[PDB]
Write an enzyme that holds these catalytic residues in place. Structure first.
Site: not given
Ligand code: KHD
Length: 271
Positions: A133, A137-138, A151
């Site tokens: 995916d 956005r990811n 992700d």
């Molecule tokens: C653009 C869309 C958006 O707003 N996405 C968003 C919003 C708020 C928080 C988000 O996740 C974040 C933000 C900042 N840092 C991190 N690391 C993350 C985050 C944390 C955990 C995961 O999970 C996984 C990461 C890697 C592999 C598997 C799962 C993803 C993002 C994103």
């Protein structure tokens, strides 16, 4: 310590500092691990994920390690909801970052973002690990402007069928090659396709792909061999690179290794 596997973080070691947002798994937070270390904490909404399968796959994910890949630190299990603990990406998701016009990006910066992601994908490819995916956005951005992929693989464990197949109203049709849309045939080459769409997103400063079409119309457009076209900010050499990810025939699509080489060449030539 006692009671925790190597893939297992003790929740008590966490201090929550700030809320970051809510996705289809729910809330994500910024905080500290053992008082010092920045982490992100993603809380899995009860009922949203195939939790046992995920936890087992978490073990595999822990061994994935690359500077352009969001580092999984561990997981918090046998509590509800379960947490996924990762490095903290201060500047958030690539998609929103690109849409903020104030950054006034040079195309050099955009090419670098592409290279960031392509390095991550070449690494995953080298470990025979599919993202499944990939999209703006990811991807996330850290405090230094570095883009990292996040992700990875995660969609395998989503229980909401609106997300899980081509006939679902929340499937990434716009990032999917014809053989995925037609036959659900996933591979390294469907990751490639999605990568060229991501280069397009980047050079388009976050426009939604096929922004005038519905998903259904997009699928038909793709199936008929029609394609995204060149963003204004993309040179001919850059467009060639993204366009090459969209060969109707999957085996004619390049690898992430060849993409990286192409991107380095363009970088040297447009430097
Ligand atoms: C653009 C869309 C958006 O707003 N996405 C968003 C919003 C708020 C928080 C988000 O996740 C974040 C933000 C900042 N840092 C991190 N690391 C993350 C985050 C944390 C955990 C995961 O999970 C996984 C990461 C890697 C592999 C598997 C799962 C993803 C993002 C994103």
């Amino acid at each position: 310590g006692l009671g925790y596997g190597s893939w297992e973080i003790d929740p008590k070691d966490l201090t929550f500092l700030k809320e970051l947002g809510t996705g289809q798994f729910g809330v994500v937070k910024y905080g500290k691990w053992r008082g010092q270390y920045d982490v992100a904490i993603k809380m899995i909404k009860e009922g949203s994920m195939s939790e046992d399968e995920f936890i087992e796959e978490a073990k595999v994910m822990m061994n994935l390690s690359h500077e352009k890949l969001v580092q999984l630190y561990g997981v918090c299990t046998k509590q509800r909801p379960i947490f996924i603990i990762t490095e903290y990406m201060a500047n958030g998701c690539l998609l929103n970052y690109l849409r903020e016009m104030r950054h006034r990006f040079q195309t050099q910066q955009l090419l670098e973002m592409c290279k960031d992601v392509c390095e991550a994908m070449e690494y995953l490819e080298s470990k025979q690990f599919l993202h499944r995916d990939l999209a703006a956005r990811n991807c996330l951005v850290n405090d230094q402007g570095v883009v990292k992929v996040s992700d990875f693989g995660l969609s395998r464990y989503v229980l909401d069928d609106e997300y899980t197949s081509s006939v679902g109203s929340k499937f990434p049709v716009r990032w999917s090659p014809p053989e995925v849309l037609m036959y659900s045939k996933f591979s390294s080459k469907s990751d490639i396709w999605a990568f060229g769409v991501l280069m397009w997103e980047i050079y388009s400063l976050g426009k939604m792909p096929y922004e005038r079409f519905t998903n259904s119309e997009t699928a038909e457009h793709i199936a008929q061999g029609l394609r995204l076209y060149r963003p204004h900010l993309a040179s001919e050499k850059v467009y060639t690179i993204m366009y090459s990810c969209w060969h109707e025939k999957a085996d004619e699509r390049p690898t992430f290794k060849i993409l990286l080489s192409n991107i380095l060449d363009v970088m040297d030539e447009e430097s």
